[PDB]
């Protein structure tokens, strides 16, 4: 189902490693549990859930074939947060700070994807 | 019958001020809303709720007769968190870090209480 590539290794050992240690990453460590968190409209609004714990496990289990998938999973995780929450909610400001770092690291990723 | 004392001024202008600025203080700024947060046994276990917003308002309005009463409210706030949550929960470690700062500040409070 997946491969080792230079870009995926970069996503794991640079992007995820950096983001996981960030002070604002913790709300994204696990899938949103709409029952425990009392979010009765979450699944009505969000049809493609994603979180950084799932992304990290996918990298550790070689689930991804290309880093493009891992980048899209990050995009989905962040966009879901903006769609569901108000622009003034702290979680949205945290997501934005994380996404800026994500984009900074993506700018520096190896530009050609090579299987390893 | 409240008072204005040297120690109460210290509780307001040193203790509350310092703790409010800490990155872990935000769960304690307002009373726990057990309904919103989906904690249905909260008030069964926690019969004396307390939070730092209440403490701050009490100091701002000369509610306390002595700083000892304000220290009691801080202890109630921290202990409620230690009681309700499980021992390894993040919020317990946050409360422990805040209590450490609280105790360090209390150690530097003027030792005799004088009404101003």
């Amino acid at each position: 189902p997946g491969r080792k590539t230079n870009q995926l290794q970069y996503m794991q050992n640079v992007v995820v490693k950096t983001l996981w240690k960030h002070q604002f990453a913790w709300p994204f460590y696990q899938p949103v549990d709409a029952i425990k968190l009392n979010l009765p409209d979450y699944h009505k609004i969000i049809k493609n859930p994603m979180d950084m714990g799932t992304i990290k496990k996918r990298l550790e289990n070689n689930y991804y074939w290309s880093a493009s998938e891992c980048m899209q999973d990050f995009n989905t995780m962040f966009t879901n947060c903006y769609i569901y929450n108000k622009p003034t909610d702290d979680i949205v400001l945290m997501a934005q700070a994380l996404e800026k770092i994500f984009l900074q690291k993506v700018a520096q990723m190896p530009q050609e994807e090579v299987e390893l | 019958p409240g008072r204005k004392t040297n120690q109460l001024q210290y509780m307001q202008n040193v203790v509350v001020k310092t703790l409010w600025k800490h990155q872990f203080a935000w769960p304690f700024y307002q009373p726990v809303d057990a309904i919103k947060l989906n904690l249905p046994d909260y008030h069964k276990i926690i019969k004396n709720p307390m939070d730092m917003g209440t403490i701050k308002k009490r100091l701002e309005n000369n509610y306390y007769w002595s700083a000892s009463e304000c220290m009691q409210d801080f202890n109630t706030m921290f202990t409620n968190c230690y009681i309700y949550n499980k021992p390894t929960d993040d919020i317990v470690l946050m409360a422990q870090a805040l209590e450490k700062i609280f105790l360090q500040k209390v150690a530097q409070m003027p030792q005799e209480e004088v009404e101003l």
Binding site: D33, D90, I91, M94 | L37
Partner: peptide, 11 residues
């Protein structure tokens, strides 16, 4: 402004 955060923290 921190409610979802408090929920995540508690759960």
């Amino acid at each position: 402004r921190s409610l979802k955060l408090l929920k995540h923290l508690k759960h």
